[PDB]
Amino acid sequence: KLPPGPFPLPIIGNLFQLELKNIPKSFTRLAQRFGPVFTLYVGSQRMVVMHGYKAVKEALLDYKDEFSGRGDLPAFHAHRDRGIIFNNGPTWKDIRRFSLTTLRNYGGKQGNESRIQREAHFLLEALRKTQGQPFDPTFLIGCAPCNVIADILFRKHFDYNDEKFLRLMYLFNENFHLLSTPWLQLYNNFPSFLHYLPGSHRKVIKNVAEVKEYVSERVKEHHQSLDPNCPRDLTDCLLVEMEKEKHSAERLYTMDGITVTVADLFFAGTETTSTTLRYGLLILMKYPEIEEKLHEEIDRVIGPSRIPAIKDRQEMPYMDAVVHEIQRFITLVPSNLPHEATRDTIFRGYLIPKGTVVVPTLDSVLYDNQEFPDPEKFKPEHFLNENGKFKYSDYFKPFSTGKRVCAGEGLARMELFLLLCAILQHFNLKPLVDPKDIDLSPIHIGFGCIPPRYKLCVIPRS
Numbered sequence: 001k002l003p004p005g006p007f008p009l010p011i012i013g014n015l016f017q018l019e020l021k022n023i024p025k026s027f028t029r030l031a032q033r034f035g036p037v038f039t040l041y042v043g044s045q046r047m048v049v050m051h052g053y054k055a056v057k058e059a060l061l062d063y064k065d066e067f068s069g070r071g072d073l074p075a076f077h078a079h080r081d082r083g084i085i086f087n088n089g090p091t092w093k094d095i096r097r098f099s100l101t102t103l104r105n106y107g108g109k110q111g112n113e114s115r116i117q118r119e120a121h122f123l124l125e126a127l128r129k130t131q132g133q134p135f136d137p138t139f140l141i142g143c144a145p146c147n148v149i150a151d152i153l154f155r156k157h158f159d160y161n162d163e164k165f166l167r168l169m170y171l172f173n174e175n176f177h178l179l180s181t182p183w184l185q186l187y188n189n190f191p192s193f194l195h196y197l198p199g200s201h202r203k204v205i206k207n208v209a210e211v212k213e214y215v216s217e218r219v220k221e222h223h224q225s226l227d228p229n230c231p232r233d234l235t236d237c238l239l240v241e242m243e244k245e246k247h248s249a250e251r252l253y254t255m256d257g258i259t260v261t262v263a264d265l266f267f268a269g270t271e272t273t274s275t276t277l278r279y280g281l282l283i284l285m286k287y288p289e290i291e292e293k294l295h296e297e298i299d300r301v302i303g304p305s306r307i308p309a310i311k312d313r314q315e316m317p318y319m320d321a322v323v324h325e326i327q328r329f330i331t332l333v334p335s336n337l338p339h340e341a342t343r344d345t346i347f348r349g350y351l352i353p354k355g356t357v358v359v360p361t362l363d364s365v366l367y368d369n370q371e372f373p374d375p376e377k378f379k380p381e382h383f384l385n386e387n388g389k390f391k392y393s394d395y396f397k398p399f400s401t402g403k404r405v406c407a408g409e410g411l412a413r414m415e416l417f418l419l420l421c422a423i424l425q426h427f428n429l430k431p432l433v434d435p436k437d438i439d440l441s442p443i444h445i446g447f448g449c450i451p452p453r454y455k456l457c458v459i460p461r462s
């Protein structure tokens, strides 16, 4: 007994029920019609969508092992079943677990804060270097989290002007962008009919292969000078783990597997944080009054010169709330990443067969209209008690939750606080249009929500 849903058509299933430019909106439309759990056929493939905190929470937390699979994403077939993001195989569990331990060992530790704090040095330099002229913040702000993850992964630090640096960011940006477009949405559910026609899916595929090749080469480089006594980074810690298991019959790690793990952490480690920061700057420019309040709190708690520290969050409730509100407001990965039933499952009273794609929607949660009155409006007080202290919400789920929760959550959240603190400590944001004319709406919705392209100026405070 499948969850209720619209009557599918031959070949295309439910494609008339879906607006490809705005799948999250189609999902919301379908939840009004059929309730919090529903069935869809997108092409021949069956999915069940959960919509709203209760349904999304049950799916991700009560049936953790049942939905701990990962739905196929054809554009990233080069990663499928290797690493962590795109694998629905036996190898997922211990590669994930090991990566998380290594990530954590590399930073509570204060290695993460320090690492972020020292990148803020280079980020702040680049912004001063624009000397108050208009600039596209895309490939400037983006260097910050990209270097931070490069330190952990490769022991590698890049100049902001360096050629392969800018190119890797370009490809990350292009992929996140194109994956959020309607042609790619159609491609991921009809890959066999469409794969060999021309179109943007081919750019994504080429792009994925280029990043993988760049990673691959850094990995083999790491092999050729690996000191098993003295691992330099996460890429090393994975090499060490592969060669402890030389004699083993069953292999957890391959050289292909590790490059995928690294290519994963490199892409995810860079793109979502950069997009978040970039969106956050555009929002703060739409509400001059919010930036002002931020400036006074930074001047009061930290002052004009002392490098922001994580221990400042407790004492900066307005900043803390704004940072949460940026992530809640932009719903950056608004349908989550797709899950799948590892087993024939009984959810509520419905059968969800093995290998049904399961979509525990995140925007439906982050935009709950009772948890967050006026959820469509940007409001720091969505995360502030009436007496002005930071207010926690169980609805703040932008990193998802459960078995497949974002592997970089700790890092990302630290980065957003400390980098946004740093930027506002030293700079005023200057929009090139009137704050009233700024349209905050995503220009593409799919895999992510993509901000409009814009230029701005930053005007030094110190």
Ligand code: HEM
Residues within 6 Å of the ligand: 070, 084, 085, 086, 096, 103, 264, 265, 268, 269, 270, 272, 273, 276, 332, 333, 336, 337, 338, 398, 399, 400, 401, 403, 404, 405, 406, 407, 408, 409, 411, 412
């Ligand atoms: C603002 C920044 C970020 C946001 C909004 C974000 C969001 C997400 C979401 C929604 C998922 C899917 C979870 C699920 O399937 O239930 C995910 C997974 C993942 N993230 Fe993030 N993320 C961010 C930053 C990062 C960073 C910095 C890293 C690198 C350490 C990272 C690495 C990963 C990996 C490897 C996965 C796949 C988890 C798995 O499939 O087992 N992410 N993220």
Ligand SMILES: c1ccc2[nH]ncc2c1
Residues within 6 Å of the ligand: 085, 176, 267, 268, 269, 271, 272, 406
């Ligand atoms: C793709 C791009 C950015 C990401 N952050 N977390 C998972 C992820 C995947």
